Amino acid sequence: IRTLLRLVPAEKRGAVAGYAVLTLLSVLLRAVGAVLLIPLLAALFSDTPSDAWLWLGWLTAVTLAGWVTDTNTARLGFDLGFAVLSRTQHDMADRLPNVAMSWFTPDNTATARQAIAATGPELAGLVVNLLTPLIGAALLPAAIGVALLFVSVPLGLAALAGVAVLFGALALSGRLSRAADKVAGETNSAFTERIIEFARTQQALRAARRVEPARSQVGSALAAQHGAGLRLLTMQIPGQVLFSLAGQVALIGFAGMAVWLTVRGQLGVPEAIALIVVLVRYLEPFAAIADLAPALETTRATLNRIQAVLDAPTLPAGRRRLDRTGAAPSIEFDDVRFSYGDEVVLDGVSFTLRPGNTTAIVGPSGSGKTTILSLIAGLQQPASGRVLLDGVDVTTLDPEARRAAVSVVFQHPYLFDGTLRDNVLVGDPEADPDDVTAAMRLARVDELLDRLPDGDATVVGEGGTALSGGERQRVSIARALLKPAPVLLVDEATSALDNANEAAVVDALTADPRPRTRVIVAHRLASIRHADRVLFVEAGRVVEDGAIDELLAAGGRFAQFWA
């Protein structure tokens, strides 16, 4: 319950206090309704049974008040559960794009997926499914025990003593089954990730024959998950036993005290028979809590994953804004240094890109030139040093102004599951259809429209897997060119393109009418014909720079690199 209050918005704290007051009031009315039976039957069996009308009226009033309170508790619990759901899911959706790139480790990415995947109805009705009955069942025998004190002090003390073993059984059941449940949750998450990999990497797994359950990674994860699942069922046996023993101990304590008072004459026979029914009402929560306790640990793990994602380290950001009406800014690296963990990618790299010129970045593979584009676009940030757009440190820029300043063609072009037009329109959803068609024409997407059966309405798979490699690349290029960013970063836009489409797209990138600062990464000299300046990036540092013809005549690493 403690972790839930952290996730509740500050807006809904007013409803939580009302929820808690009504939940306590509901438990009190249930206890008073159960204990009112004792005066009721005591008068009912007397020689003047008409006295029972007074107690029946109180029982009816407590019952109707029980209906109203528990209905309002359900309504408030429903609102609180969805209020927590909507706000925490929006916070995860709004925070994750700002989370640092290095945070998305395979374990953290699994955690993020599970947290978002918790949007289903199980998390939504949590306050009604779990907290409302858990709090009610836990406090009901205590409330009956407190209420019995008005009838007989030692009898109420006996009920409270029975409540002590209940919390004792609850604590021991939790502590015994925590380790097994934690391992069960870990293995279940592992199996989910391997299923996702199994469906995504299905081509490569089949070719490698690691696809049968006897051989595949998912098969091993299933074996571990089933083993952990059966162990969890084993370690819940002491929980079931301890709750049963707690119920029997409470029954023996309650019945023995009532019998002891009846023998001593401090308790009438009709009160004792009424107490049999109260004992049954007293022992029902001992069984309800047993059914609710296993779900409590699983919920705690779920909310822990949600809180972990909300606690992710957001990337630094400021509020500066470029003073350009979509005009070309200058770009510079000022002694930039960057590393992935202990691996240094860039150290001492420095360059300056003029606003209206097109610059090429080349060099061996694994040399850090995609890192340079990512730092320019703000996806990464330096460990030390600073990168400036138009003389403004991008780490101090508004995130809206940071992402409205750059449009990027990624090395591995990812497309979302949807129509081809929607992927193109992601660059600028409010685009004029004249502007969209111009973007499609420049990217040679018009070939796809005329050649594909469905045109721009062609459905793309998860990723760009329902299209060819060279076709998802052109759709991504159309997506980048549609956006009116003054900085255009091209990360191998012609890797998977034939020579004809490569030449057409390469001419289009330079022929893009609006002014921009263009940074192009290429492994093919035909794709950087128009670049005004070069940045040869080898071993993480810009070894040499100049024009293409200038470096070719120089006979440095450029000429050998293009031999």
Partner 1 sequence: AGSRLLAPLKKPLIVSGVLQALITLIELAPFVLLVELARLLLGGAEAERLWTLGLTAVSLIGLGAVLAAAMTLWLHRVDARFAHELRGRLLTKLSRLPLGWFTRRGSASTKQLVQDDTLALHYLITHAIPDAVAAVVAPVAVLVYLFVADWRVALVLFIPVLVYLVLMSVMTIQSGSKIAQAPRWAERMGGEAGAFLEGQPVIRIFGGAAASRFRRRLDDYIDFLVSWQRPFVGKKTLMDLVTRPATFLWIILVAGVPLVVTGRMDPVNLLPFLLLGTTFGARLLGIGYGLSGIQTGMLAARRIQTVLDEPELVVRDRTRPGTVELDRVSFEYRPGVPVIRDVTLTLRPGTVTALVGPSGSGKSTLAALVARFHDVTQGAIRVDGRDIRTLTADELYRRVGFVLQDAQLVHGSVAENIALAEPDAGLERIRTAARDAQIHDRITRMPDGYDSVLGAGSALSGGERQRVTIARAILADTPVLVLDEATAFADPESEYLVQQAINRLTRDRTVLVIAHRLHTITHADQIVVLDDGRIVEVGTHDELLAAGGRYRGLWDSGR
Exactly one of 256, 326, 418, 469 binds Mg ion (CB under 5 A); which one?
469
- The CA radius of gyration of the chain, in Å to the nearest whole number, is 34
**Is residue 483 marked as binding?**
no
Crossing angle of helices 269-310 and 237-264, rounded to 10°: 150
Exactly one of 6, 21, 102, 383 binds partner 1 (CB under 8 A); which one?
102
What is the separation, in whole angstroms, between the first and last Cα of the chain? 67
Our finding on whether 153 is near partner 1 (CB under 8 A) is no
Q: State the Cα–Cα distance between residues 260 and 299, nearest whole angstrom.
A: 43
In terms of DSSP H, where are the helices of 96-152? 106-117, 121-124, 126, 132-151
Our finding on whether 285 is near partner 1 (CB under 8 A) is no
**Is residue 318 marked as binding?**
no
CB of 201 to partner 1, least distance (A): 5
Q: State the Cα–Cα distance between residues 330 and 548, nearest whole angstrom.
A: 21
Q: State the Cα–Cα distance between residues 430 and 483, nearest whole angstrom.
A: 10
**Is residue 369 marked as binding?**
yes
Torsion of CA 293, 296, 301, 305, to 10 degrees: 170
Beta carbons of 479 and 400 less than 8 angstroms apart: no
Our finding on whether 539 is near partner 1 (CB under 8 A) is no
Exactly one of 189, 216, 370, 380 binds Mg ion (CB under 5 A); which one?
370
Exactly one of 11, 203, 450, 549 binds partner 1 (CB under 8 A); which one?
203
CB of 468 to Mg ion, least distance (A): 5
Residue numbers 64-103 binding Mg ion by CB under 5 A: none
Q: How far does Cα 116 stand from its chain's mean position?
A: 3
Sign of CA dihedral 67, 69, 72, 76: negative
Question: Between residues 156 and 239, which has the closer beta carbon with respect to partner 1?
Answer: 239
Question: Site mask, Mg ion, residues 398-427, x = CB under 5 A?
Answer: -------------x----------------
Q: Which does 226 bind (CB under 5 to 8 A by kind): partner 1, Mg ion, none?
A: partner 1
Residue numbers 424-443 binding partner 1 by CB under 8 A: 426-427, 429
Our finding on whether 461 is near Mg ion (CB under 5 A) is no
Residue type, 553: A
Crossing angle of helices 13-35 and 52-95, rounded to 10°: 150
Q: Comparing C-alpha atoms, which of 436, 470, 433 is closest to residue 451?
A: 470
Our finding on whether 74 is near partner 1 (CB under 8 A) is yes
Q: State the Cα–Cα distance between residues 445 and 476, nearest whole angstrom.
A: 10
Our finding on whether 177 is near Mg ion (CB under 5 A) is no
**Is residue 364 marked as binding?**
yes
Q: State the Cα–Cα distance between residues 322 and 398, nearest whole angstrom.
A: 9
Our finding on whether 465 is near Mg ion (CB under 5 A) is no
CA angle 456, 457, 461 (to 5 degrees): 105
Q: State the Cα–Cα distance between residues 165 and 169, nearest whole angstrom.
A: 6
Question: Between residues 150 and 416, which has the closer beta carbon with respect to partner 1?
Answer: 416
**Is residue 57 marked as binding?**
no
CB of 448 to partner 1, least distance (A): 7
Residue numbers 320-379 binding partner 1 by CB under 8 A: 341-343, 363-366, 370, 374, 377, 379
Q: Which does 533 bind (CB under 5 to 8 A by kind): partner 1, Mg ion, none?
A: none
Here the tokens at position 264 are: 């001593």
Our finding on whether 417 is near partner 1 (CB under 8 A) is yes
Exactly one of 49, 168, 391, 455 binds partner 1 (CB under 8 A); which one?
49
**Is residue 189 marked as binding?**
no
Exactly one of 20, 208, 383, 539 binds partner 1 (CB under 8 A); which one?
208
CB of 402 to Mg ion, least distance (A): 21
Q: Comparing C-alpha atoms, which of 414, 427, 476, 426 is closest to residue 448?
A: 476
Q: Which does 54 bind (CB under 5 to 8 A by kind): partner 1, Mg ion, none?
A: none
Our finding on whether 26 is near Mg ion (CB under 5 A) is no
For the annotated binding site, the residues are 363-370
For the annotated binding site for ATP, the residues are 363-370
